[PDB]
Subunit: 218 residues, 6 copies
Amino acid sequence: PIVQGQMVHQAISPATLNAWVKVVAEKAFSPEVIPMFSALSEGATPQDLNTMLNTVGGHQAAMQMLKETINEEAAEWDRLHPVHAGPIAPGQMREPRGSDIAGTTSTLQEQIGWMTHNPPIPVGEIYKRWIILGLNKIVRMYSPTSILDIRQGPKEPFRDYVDRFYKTLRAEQASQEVKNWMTETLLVQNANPDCKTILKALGPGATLEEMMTACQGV
Amino acid sequence: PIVQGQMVHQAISPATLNAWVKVVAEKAFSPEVIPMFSALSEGATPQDLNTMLNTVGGHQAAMQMLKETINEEAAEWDRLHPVHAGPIAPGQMREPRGSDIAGTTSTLQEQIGWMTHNPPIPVGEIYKRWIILGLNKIVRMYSPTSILDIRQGPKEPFRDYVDRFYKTLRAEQASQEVKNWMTETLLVQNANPDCKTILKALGPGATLEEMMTACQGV
Amino acid sequence: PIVQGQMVHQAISPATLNAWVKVVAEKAFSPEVIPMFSALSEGATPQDLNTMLNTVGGHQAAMQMLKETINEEAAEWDRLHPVHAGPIAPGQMREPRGSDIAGTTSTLQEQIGWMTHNPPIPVGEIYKRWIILGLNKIVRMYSPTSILDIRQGPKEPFRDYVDRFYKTLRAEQASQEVKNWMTETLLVQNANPDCKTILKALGPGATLEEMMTACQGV
Amino acid sequence: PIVQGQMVHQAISPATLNAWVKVVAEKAFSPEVIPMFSALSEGATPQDLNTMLNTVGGHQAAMQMLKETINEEAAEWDRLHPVHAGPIAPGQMREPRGSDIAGTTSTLQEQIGWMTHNPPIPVGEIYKRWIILGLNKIVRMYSPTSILDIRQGPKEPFRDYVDRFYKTLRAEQASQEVKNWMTETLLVQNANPDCKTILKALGPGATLEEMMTACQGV
Amino acid sequence: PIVQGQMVHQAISPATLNAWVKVVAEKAFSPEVIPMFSALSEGATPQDLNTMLNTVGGHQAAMQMLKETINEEAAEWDRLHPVHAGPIAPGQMREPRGSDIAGTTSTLQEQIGWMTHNPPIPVGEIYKRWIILGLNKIVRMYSPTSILDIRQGPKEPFRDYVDRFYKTLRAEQASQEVKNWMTETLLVQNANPDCKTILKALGPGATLEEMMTACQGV
Amino acid sequence: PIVQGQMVHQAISPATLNAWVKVVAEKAFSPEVIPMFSALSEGATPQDLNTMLNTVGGHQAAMQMLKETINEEAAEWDRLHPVHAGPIAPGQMREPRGSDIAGTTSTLQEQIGWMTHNPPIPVGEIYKRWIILGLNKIVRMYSPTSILDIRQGPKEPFRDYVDRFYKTLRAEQASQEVKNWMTETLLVQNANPDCKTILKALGPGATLEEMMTACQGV
Ligand SMILES: [Cl-]
Ligand SMILES: [Cl-]
Ligand SMILES: [Cl-]
Ligand SMILES: [Cl-]
Ligand SMILES: [Cl-]
Ligand SMILES: [Cl-]
Ligand SMILES: [Cl-]
Ligand SMILES: [Cl-]
Ligand SMILES: [Cl-]
Ligand SMILES: [Cl-]
Ligand SMILES: [Cl-]
Ligand SMILES: [Cl-]
Ligand SMILES: [Cl-]
Ligand SMILES: [Cl-]
Ligand SMILES: [Cl-]
Ligand SMILES: [Cl-]
Ligand SMILES: [Cl-]
Ligand SMILES: [Cl-]
Ligand SMILES: [Cl-]
Ligand SMILES: [Cl-]
Ligand SMILES: [Cl-]
Ligand SMILES: [Cl-]
Ligand SMILES: [Cl-]
Ligand SMILES: [Cl-]
Ligand SMILES: [Cl-]
Ligand SMILES: [Cl-]
Ligand SMILES: [Cl-]
Ligand SMILES: [Cl-]
Ligand SMILES: [Cl-]
Ligand SMILES: [Cl-]
Ligand SMILES: [Cl-]
Ligand SMILES: [Cl-]
Ligand SMILES: [Cl-]
Ligand SMILES: [Cl-]
Ligand SMILES: [Cl-]
Ligand SMILES: [Cl-]
Ligand SMILES: [Cl-]
Ligand SMILES: [Cl-]
Ligand SMILES: [Cl-]
Ligand SMILES: [Cl-]
Ligand SMILES: [Cl-]
Ligand SMILES: [Cl-]
């Protein structure tokens, strides 16, 4: 990663590596893996990001899908940033291609140069953007449950049902307004009859705290 | 977090991440989780705080309630800080909205800029304030016991009873004067008959050390 | 904690937090917990000290007694340092109250300002003084044994007896001269008959090394 | 490793050493070992690289093959960089031989001098290049499976088959275009009859996400 | 500990504390504990040394003997450094007493001042000297074996016998010349008959490598 | 260890100590222990080296042989560097003796002074040289196998045989040309009949990769 105020390079730490390998080995592609990844790659160069992706053993289907997604994003970047012919001037550096952002056709020195330029070309945050896009696709694809099948059991405490519901919902990754609708309709629509009666008596604009309060002892 | 005297940014450490994930996995929403959180987020940007909140897998009902609370606090902040139209002057930066404090509509650079300004706009401590507010609500809601039901057993050592009583009391989170009353009335009112007689003989203005001393061998 | 020679602030480390939580969970209130605490809070602000105290889950009776002790010390400090009315001058800062030293009515910036002033107002070491006072009271109260009941067994090696004796003695926390008397009288007075005869033959001014040497093979 | 902007030397850390020893002891020569190695040797001198290679106990056949490969690369470097006779001028340093890059005939000071020169002679990245070349040969040789023998089972979920296929493929280390052909032909050619029919119905230019989607419930 | 070239103070680290507590809990008073202690207290102030000594729970007999030894050394220091009456001059600091070196009557600031003075008064290394003296006494006293009782078994490999012999010898802590004599006489004098014959045939001035070589297959 | 470009002293770290103690406790005197030692003592003073050697509990026969070797090297150094009488000039420091390099008759300040002088007297790397010499002698002496007794089993895969062969060879520590001969003759001479026939058919100048390839399926 790159960390008076001058930005300087730093090798990826063994604690970062062990934490990334560990969370991938433990939690596969549960949603919380994506912020953890984002947490462990703060300020990372494309080289660091490729380092974390390549240290993943197994799950090579998902890693291959991630490669496909990264290639699509690189191709779109190339389409929106046509390269200019000519000798790079002294005091300047070439503008990056899609593969330069992905770290496969650029050196570490070129990445450092882009990231510390005035103004900065943040190839690290762009690449991380693409990676997180692909990770979202994988987390969505590998989710075992659908939000339409989360129904509260006849004896299931309301808290556990809400836990399952919002876990699945987080895996869905639909737009914010769509999730507003799902919370607005399915959560009460799929509760068990007693709690469902109580929640109907609560009212349309009910917060989650009020709903969980109403069905506590129930 | 942000840490000559000039304040500088720093990526959240793997030891911080592992400690937060670990304490959430172990202790759920026991009261001591809240200072631990506050301990691990010292000087955190809103990005760091969102990082710790998002790495929590499971307990998605509580995380959703936390989202609701944060939204209420953001709306109140917007109501008390009406935004001003106009171009941001060179040498200044825009004043944050509620969602800018919550880190969802502001960059890391804008957060750093607010936090290191003269005078400082401490969006990190404000956001942490809101988060801790929501965490207090969750700890209160998930507490299994009520302070009115803590009664000393006929053979229960006074120390264990006081432990249960003040644990539950800490979970209650009532105002200071209300807790003064609960200590003033319930603790002796709910002791077992022998210890209760001794404590009555102690006197109204008895400290906890005196009370535990009086019922030691008893 | 606060650490060219200029003193600068630092967030409490996850290794410090985990070590404190761990030693409290393991050893409860054995005497060695108090230096360990003092070890982990070197240069701590009142905020850091409150952080370590608040992360303790359970033992809420002892934590409540600690709160009482801290309140007494704060009240005495207020009685010996009467506050002065008037506007704080530019280039100065208000003198702290008892609750400001305890960190409950002062900001982190005010604590830093007092601790780095010329001359320094060491609110951190004062607060730690009060805390260690209360911890000593708790360690004394929770000790299971009394120094008058430590008697060497008929077959008990002298080393084990001395270990028990000085462990209990350390828990007693009596004044230095009182402990001089206890070592002077009880240790030989409570030895088993054979070792007791040998130690009587040693002489009044016998060191511990000589005494343990004399009853080795015995 | 070597890490204002001035590059400075640093001893290899115990966390790096323990991580390298650990991953070699655990994963032998699975492909992911090579990026991990590259991760733990960022900015390493030839001395650091030899340190990591020499700490490997066992697998001495592979370590010997690695020695052979490094010797070949050193001999080629010597053939392409003929040495020049004459006294090294004040303000200059000798140009390295193959064995100087491999760290066996050069001091740590000479390596530091080459790596921090203007312009730099990056003996560390050259040596790491050779080492990774040999590691690739070993990973290829020790792979238990061939890509032509990966066939989907009659009841095997398509995800598991793709996992095995791309794992083996990663071990193959063939050129990019050859792997394009293998993905293009073998993956569907070796699927089970039902999934194979579906994938044939998908079309020639099918991405992995589409293929795995089509054979999900199947 | 105290660590441009200016010496600066530093709080004792949790890794140091945990390592010291761990080695004391594991190895009691085996000889290797003393260098480990010396290793973990490099550059320590008397406050740090007292911190490590006080964190030891149990073994209070040995800790009490250590207190006695430290008191003797402090009294001797006071006898050889008579204090001078008079006001301490501006730009100077008082000369330390024995108890000031032991850290019980001196502040951390006074210790820092002595240790960083020109010329330095190294109270930390003096105190560590006294402590290591007492630790040597304890290791000597608690050793279970005597060097005169180490005899090679009739079937015991010579290597194991030499291991026991030099372990016990290290616990003896006799002067260098005395240990020269013990190696010179006892080692062969106490070997088993066959090895003893071989070693007699070796010659008087035999090194340990030659002796262990001669009785290898034997 | 000693680490703008100015070299500065540093206390040996608890992670270094724990790693050294751990690897000695685990692997005894396998060859890989020697580079690990060299890894953990990078830039070490003689004090640090003596610290690591002294923390080894047990194996006191080997530690005693190491002492003998270090004494021989010190005596040779004294024979080749005769000391000069006279007062050390202001701005200079005395030239070290053999025992000064071994750290037993020199202070830490004198070692630091030699190591940071212009030009440098590298007592740390000299002492480490002697230590590694003695460690090589011990690893050679304690090796359980001889290279002439490594014979491939009738059903033993060629890879395992080569592993045993080069492990033993590494323990032999013969000169480079001698090991060239051992690889040249014994490896094929001691293979099992079938593999031996294949390797004979390969040719005299066969690399290890070719040999292991030829006897793979065999
Ligand atoms: Cl994995
Ligand atoms: Cl999965
Ligand atoms: Cl890779
Ligand atoms: Cl851009
Ligand atoms: Cl952009
Ligand atoms: Cl579910
Ligand atoms: Cl419920
Ligand atoms: Cl969780
Ligand atoms: Cl819970
Ligand atoms: Cl998230
Ligand atoms: Cl404000
Ligand atoms: Cl505010
Ligand atoms: Cl309870
Ligand atoms: Cl009790
Ligand atoms: Cl606890
Ligand atoms: Cl307790
Ligand atoms: Cl709290
Ligand atoms: Cl004061
Ligand atoms: Cl004061
Ligand atoms: Cl007892
Ligand atoms: Cl005894
Ligand atoms: Cl291994
Ligand atoms: Cl293998
Ligand atoms: Cl080696
Ligand atoms: Cl070059
Ligand atoms: Cl090159
Ligand atoms: Cl397979
Ligand atoms: Cl599937
Ligand atoms: Cl202990
Ligand atoms: Cl013991
Ligand atoms: Cl103490
Ligand atoms: Cl002195
Ligand atoms: Cl002195
Ligand atoms: Cl023995
Ligand atoms: Cl033997
Ligand atoms: Cl050992
Ligand atoms: Cl061994
Ligand atoms: Cl020693
Ligand atoms: Cl020299
Ligand atoms: Cl030399
Ligand atoms: Cl073997
Ligand atoms: Cl094979």
